[PDB]
Design an enzyme around this catalytic site. Structure first.
Site, mmCIF file in Angstrom:
data_model
loop_
_atom_site.group_PDB
_atom_site.id
_atom_site.type_symbol
_atom_site.label_atom_id
_atom_site.label_comp_id
_atom_site.label_asym_id
_atom_site.label_seq_id
_atom_site.Cartn_x
_atom_site.Cartn_y
_atom_site.Cartn_z
ATOM 1 N N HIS A 72 0.805 -1.220 0.000
ATOM 2 C CA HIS A 72 0.000 0.000 0.000
ATOM 3 C C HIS A 72 0.852 1.291 0.000
ATOM 4 O O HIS A 72 0.366 2.351 -0.378
ATOM 5 C CB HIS A 72 -0.971 0.028 1.200
ATOM 6 C CG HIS A 72 -2.339 0.569 0.899
ATOM 7 N ND1 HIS A 72 -2.873 0.642 -0.378
ATOM 8 C CD2 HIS A 72 -3.329 0.945 1.748
ATOM 9 C CE1 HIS A 72 -4.117 1.078 -0.297
ATOM 10 N NE2 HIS A 72 -4.415 1.271 0.981
ATOM 11 N N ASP A 79 -0.002 2.472 -5.367
ATOM 12 C CA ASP A 79 -0.249 1.052 -5.611
ATOM 13 C C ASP A 79 -1.485 0.805 -6.438
ATOM 14 O O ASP A 79 -2.522 1.467 -6.259
ATOM 15 C CB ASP A 79 -0.370 0.286 -4.316
ATOM 16 C CG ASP A 79 -1.582 0.762 -3.446
ATOM 17 O OD1 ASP A 79 -1.668 1.994 -3.158
ATOM 18 O OD2 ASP A 79 -2.386 -0.105 -2.998
ATOM 19 N N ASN A 114 -8.500 3.487 -2.279
ATOM 20 C CA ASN A 114 -9.155 4.285 -1.217
ATOM 21 C C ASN A 114 -8.504 5.641 -0.924
ATOM 22 O O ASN A 114 -9.144 6.550 -0.389
ATOM 23 C CB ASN A 114 -9.355 3.458 0.054
ATOM 24 C CG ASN A 114 -10.403 2.357 -0.128
ATOM 25 O OD1 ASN A 114 -11.446 2.591 -0.714
ATOM 26 N ND2 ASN A 114 -10.115 1.153 0.379
#
Ligand code: NA
Ligand code: NA
Length: 193
Positions: free
Chosen positions: A22, A95, A116
């Site tokens: 991430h 990512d 997100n």
């Protein structure tokens, strides 16, 4: 046609996150900063770590939000508003689950693709910023996505990802010089050596 003047790396703060997939965008921006000797300092006014310096003849800002991934917009949005940087001048490194390790793409525009961090950013500055999609693989089940993005990759996958990032860093000259179509052809043609 517009120069890239802000480069943002997405990720989570803290040493438990630093090597997780991430944090691919932090890897890219932190390597870039050190390649050109740009110091990333604590910038609590914008809830991040930030820097500014010369890259290949151009004045460029670097930003790592320290908001946690899902709130990345709380750093990026006011930062880019305050310095009056248009979205078209922003490159955001992140990512990308939907690409394998060793794959890296420059994309312009579009939506968040379920990412997100971008999800917290697109609503406020709109979609028209450039994205460095650093491939991290998909685990397979949608069950295992959280443990994969928040996990450390094995050495082999990591070497492929790091290869990809080295290649994209070699192309930042094009991006900061306004040469986005050329940077994109050349980034997107990368395959592991
Ligand atoms: Na440095
Ligand atoms: Na630094």
């Amino acid at each position: 046609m517009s120069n890239i003047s802000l480069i943002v790396g997405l990720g989570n703060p803290g040493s438990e996150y630093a090597q997780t997939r991430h944090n691919a965008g932090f890897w890219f921006v932190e390597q870039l900063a050190d390649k050109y000797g740009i110091t990333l300092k604590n910038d609590p006014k914008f809830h991040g770590i930030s820097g500014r310096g010369n890259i290949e003849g151009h004045d460029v800002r670097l930003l790592l939000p320290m908001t946690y991934m899902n709130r990345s917009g709380q750093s990026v949005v006011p930062f880019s508003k305050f310095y009056q940087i248009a979205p078209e001048a922003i490159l955001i490194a992140h990512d990308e689950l939907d690409m394998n390790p060793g794959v890296i793409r420059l994309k312009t525009g579009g939506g968040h693709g379920g990412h997100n961090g971008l999800r917290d950013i697109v609503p406020h500055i709109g979609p028209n910023f450039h994205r460095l999609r650093i491939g991290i693989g998909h685990p397979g089940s949608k069950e295992r996505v959280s443990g994969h993005v928040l996990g450390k990759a094995p050495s082999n996958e990591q070497s492929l990802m790091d290869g990809a990032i080295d290649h994209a860093l070699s192309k930042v000259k094009l991006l900061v010089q306004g040469q986005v179509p050329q940077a994109m052809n050349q980034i997107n043609a990368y395959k592991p050596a």
